[model samples]
Target chain A: PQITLWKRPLVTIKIGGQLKEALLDTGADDTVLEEMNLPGRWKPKMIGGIGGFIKVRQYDQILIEICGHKAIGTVLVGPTPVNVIGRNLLTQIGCTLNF
Target chain B: PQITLWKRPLVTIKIGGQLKEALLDTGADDTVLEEMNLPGRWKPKMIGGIGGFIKVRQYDQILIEICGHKAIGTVLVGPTPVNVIGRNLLTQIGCTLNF
Candidate 1:
């Protein structure tokens, strides 16, 4: 799909058998989802943003299905206003910016 | 141009006769640059990100040259780790996401 920038580049994604919407955030270095419960072990970590930093649970080797494409990588669980799929998973799905 | 997600999509841009590098952030609703000096009437505003919100100065109708493409829109000035070109300007330049 070719997603124009007129609106947020948000798309439907599936994680842990649950469907959700997330933004394809090219500026973000890692994927972040709103605090949620997921299987497997997570490490306590912190991430910084434009304002400051927030503590989060870093879950590795998580599989996510983004817009019909499957990708597995580190997923951060934290207090984010919205779910964002960053470069980590975007690359795996062969996402790119075009003009 | 096609930009892959292998690394940060940093591009050189010109604003107010100065050149700087910025990230094409589809996740952000508005463009934001680090604290800088510009000649214009601005309004006090606040913008929120992953961590929290921060105070900023909103300068409207600002001209910016992004990767050789020109765009005019509202630009925010605040303390940001890096400059970000959001949807507000990305749309004007006809940027899109492809997979």
Candidate 2:
């Protein structure tokens, strides 16, 4: 049998917002929104993907350090309550373990 | 009937650490730890919660930005593969909607 998905520990980080700090994640491929917290200019921006384009807006990319190790890279902005860690990041670091 | 759960928008923000910009989240109540990516001093620090004290450690707080909107506050330090947005933050901003 072939596997369609792989589960691994997503990295975590914090992000700054218009009002406060948010928890970062790496498990979710897309970002989730926390209702009205959207920015004033936040109009529906279509996010194009291999499947199709979904209406989405771009968020800000802040500097992040993992475990106080090294600077990884910039990430795509999506809406979320506070934030979500997703695959958008894990794919880059590319380190894993299985039990 | 009784209720024990609540849903709210956590807010998405970016953070700067030793690595890159991680996807910030708010859905997670606590931070997740990757196999590694822990700080040198990150030894299992006990995290006390409403339920009890859970073993955990602290990470670094990087500057973050959300929607290129505004700079929020610094978040608590936690070990994660990347990072996770949790309730520790959601309660602060407090934005929500339900259908």
Candidate 3:
């Protein structure tokens, strides 16, 4: 699907069998999601964004479906206003920015 | 030009007659630039991102050239890891997310 930049470029994603709306963030280096309970042990890490840095739980090898495209990568669980599907996951789904 | 998600979509932008590199950020709501001391009186504003919210000066109707395409919109000047050309400007240049 081709999504125009006139909007936020938000898309539906299925992670851990739960559906949520996530942003396709080309600026972010790591994928960040809302703190939802997921099975497995995660490493504590701190990541930075436009505003500032925050502590997050890193869960690796998570399966997610974005726009019906299945991808597996490390997802950071933290307190974010919006769920971000960063370059780590975007590249897996062959996402691109076009003009 | 088509930008692959394999790398961050960073592009050279000409703003206030000065050249700088900025990210083609799809998730960011407004264009945010590092404190380069853009001229003019600006209104104080606060914006929220993934991590948290921060105080910034909002400069409106600022002319900028992104990847050679000219656009004028509101720009936020503050302390950021990188300059970001957000959807406010990306829409003006007809940028889109494709898979």
Candidate 4:
């Protein structure tokens, strides 16, 4: 299946049993979400972007569902403007860049 | 043609007569490049992301080539951590999210 790359390729994702909207960010190396409550002992990690680096709580062994595809991996929680689903989970679902 | 979405879906792009690598960022609305000399009358514009907002020089009617496909659109130049090819030019190349 193929989806059009809109101005913002935002998709619905289920994380921590809660439904949330996340941007499909192929540029990002890791998935990052806005501050959320999760059950885990997270370690502090930093991620760099266009603006600068941000401190985030790195949570491992988390389940995220995107477009009916399920993937379990690390999810970062921090003060992000939007939830981003990066290549880590994108590869699990076999998402690719097609032209 | 289709390309795997690696940790970072980077591709070679020709911008301002120079070849550079850019991240295929579906989450970003506009393409952003690291600071470089571009021939244009640019104006100040701001773009926001995970970290925050950054000021960029918006260059209009610029020519860019991505994977052999040519596209003319707006390009934002600033001090970004990485060069990002956003949806603005992605659409022109007929690139889509495939699974």
Against the true structure, whose TM-score is highest?
A: 1
Pairwise lDDT winner, candidates 2 and 4: 4
Q: A1-99 in candidate 3: lDDT tens per residue?
A: 999987778889998888999999999888999889988779999998767889999999999999999999999999988899999999999999998
Predicted structure 2, TM vs. truth:
0.27
Candidate 1 lDDT, tens digit per residue, A41-82?
999999888888999899999999999999999999999888
Interface root-mean-square deviation (Å) of every model: 0.8, 18.0, 1.1, 1.2
Clashing pairs for model 4 are: none
Q: Model 1: runs farther than 4 Å from truth?
A: none
Q: Predictions ranked by TM-score, top down?
A: 1, 3, 4, 2
Predictions' DockQ, in order: 0.88, 0.03, 0.83, 0.81
Give candidate 2 misplaced runs (Cα > 4 Å). Answer: A1-12, A16-27, A30-56, A59-62, A71-79, B1-99
- Per-residue lDDT tens digits for candidate 4, residues B53-84, read 89999999999999789999999999888899
lDDT of 2 by residue, A1-99 (tens): 111111222334444333323233323454433333433334455443212344445554434444332333434444332444334433343322110
Task: Name the lDDT value of residue A93 in candidate 2.
Answer: 38
Q: What is the DockQ of candidate 2?
A: 0.03
Cα-lDDT of candidate 1: 0.92
Query: What lDDT, from 0 to 1, does candidate 2 have?
Result: 0.36
